[PDB]
């Protein structure tokens, strides 16, 4: 019946004066626009159909055409920015927000989905959806005693839409919308469905990607222990955003970082720093670098949790980007740590893989590593042990590498080298 129509036939039906003919034609459009490959989105836009779909959203008397037109527009809105823009330009936003109240679950769900694609386009559309008042009726759909009674697909869509309202920066979402959304997100973060959990963690990761004030508003909600728990999940799609959120939190203040440690996070790092997914090791090591940038009592906790040998491991062998994060974690540990914490680092065997990484063609990591060596030499001075360290650096071939570096392009680099060379070698 409505399979494989041409655009011209769809146009003909939609322009007929006959609501049933318009409904069949709209459903045909929904079918073109939902096919597996190359849906003809631009052809539908160019035929001028968006304004007719939008006014069909308002047909309370004909719920099937509301659904077909909502689904058609969702898919248009799922494409490029210019395509999402055409949906918005047709007035879709307030019309979808009014469908949130529909007594028909499949229809308010479609409106949720459409609004998520719109808000998902970027900050300006996200904030426009919020100005049109989307958040109150979105949140009313989740106002039930027990999330478990909602259909699973429906809750997943709501969660994902709310996370798009939390997403993007420049600017970040309005502080008041974030405050409005957060209690419902905290509730979603304790739900048992893995996709709900993954998207709740993504939303939390967006909200903590910002200055300390933004981080604080999340941390004040008490979510950190739940995040650390998800950090332990067996599902990679949950671990990845849980770890991103935890990593974002530890770029905040030392007190915000302490909440992550207090919640047990460090005990998960032995598995994270050896995780077979490269991106998990990289972001675990990034996270560690922002903890070793903390107070000496926080460095101490990294030590007590047995994590220095794990840093030595990733420095010795890892994808290069993870290794660059490990080099940072080490330079941070060495500028902030006590002499005894620094001595410990050397006893776990940091020197040889630090030196091996001096052969990399990345000026930044070379800078980072010479800073670290200089820091470690500073500790050895206070102990009168600079010579013991010079030799260690000699024996694993580090001296060769530092010498060469005198003849290096960069200023810090050849500057940093000559200094160590002339100071201890």
């Amino acid at each position: 019946g409505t399979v494989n129509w041409s655009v011209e036939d769809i146009v003909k039906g939609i322009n007929s004066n006959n609501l049933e003919s318009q409904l069949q034609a709209t459903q045909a459009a929904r079918k073109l626009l939902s096919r597996e490959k190359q849906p003809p989105i631009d052809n539908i836009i160019r035929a001028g159909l968006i304004p007719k779909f939008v006014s069909f959203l308002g047909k309370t008397d004909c719920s099937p055409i509301q659904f077909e037109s909502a689904w058609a527009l969702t898919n248009i809105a799922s494409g490029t920015s210019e395509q999402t823009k055409a949906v918005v330009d047709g007035g879709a936003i307030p019309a979808f927000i009014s469908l949130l109240a529909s007594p028909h679950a499949h229809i308010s769900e479609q409106a949720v989905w459409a609004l998520g694609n719109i808000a998902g386009d970027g900050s300006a559309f996200r904030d426009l959806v919020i100005k049109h008042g989307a958040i109150d009726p979105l949140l009313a759909l989740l106002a039930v005693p027990d999330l478990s009674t909602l259909a699973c697909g429906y809750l997943r869509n709501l969660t994902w839409t709310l996370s798009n309202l939390c997403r993007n920066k420049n600017p970040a979402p309005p502080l008041d919308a974030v405050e409005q959304i957060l209690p419902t997100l905290v509730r979603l973060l304790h739900h048992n469905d893995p996709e709900v959990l993954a998207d709740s963690c993504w939303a939390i990761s967006y909200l903590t990607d910002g200055p300390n004030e933004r981080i604080e508003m999340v941390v004040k909600k008490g979510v950190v222990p739940q995040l650390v728990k998800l950090l332990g999940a067996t599902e990679l799609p949950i671990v990845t955003p849980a770890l991103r959120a935890i990593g974002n939190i530890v770029t905040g203040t030392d007190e915000q970082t302490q909440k992550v440690i207090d919640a047990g996070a460090l005990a998960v790092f032995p598995s994270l720093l050896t995780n077979p997914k490269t991106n998990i090791q990289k972001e675990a090591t990034w996270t560690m670098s922002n903890i070793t940038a903390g107070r000496q009592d926080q460095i101490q906790q990294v030590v007590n949790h047995g994590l220095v040998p794990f840093l030595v491991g990733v420095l010795s062998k890892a994808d290069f980007k993870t290794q660059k994060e490990a080099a940072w974690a080490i330079t941070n540990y060495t500028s902030g740590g006590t002499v005894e914490q620094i001595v410990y680092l050397v006893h776990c065997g940091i020197i040889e893989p630090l030196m091996n990484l001096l052969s990399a063609k990345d000026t930044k990591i070379i800078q980072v590593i010479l800073d670290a060596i200089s820091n470690i030499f500073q500790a050895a001075e206070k102990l009168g042990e600079t010579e013991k360290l010079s030799i260690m650096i000699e024996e694993c071939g580090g001296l060769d590498k530092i010498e060469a570096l005198q003849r290096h392009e960069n200023e810090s680099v050849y500057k940093a080298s000559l200094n160590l060379i002339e100071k201890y070698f």
Partner: peptide, 7 residues
């Protein structure tokens, strides 16, 4: 992905 097409 920020956007999702309904198949």
């Amino acid at each position: 992905v920020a956007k999702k097409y309904r198949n």
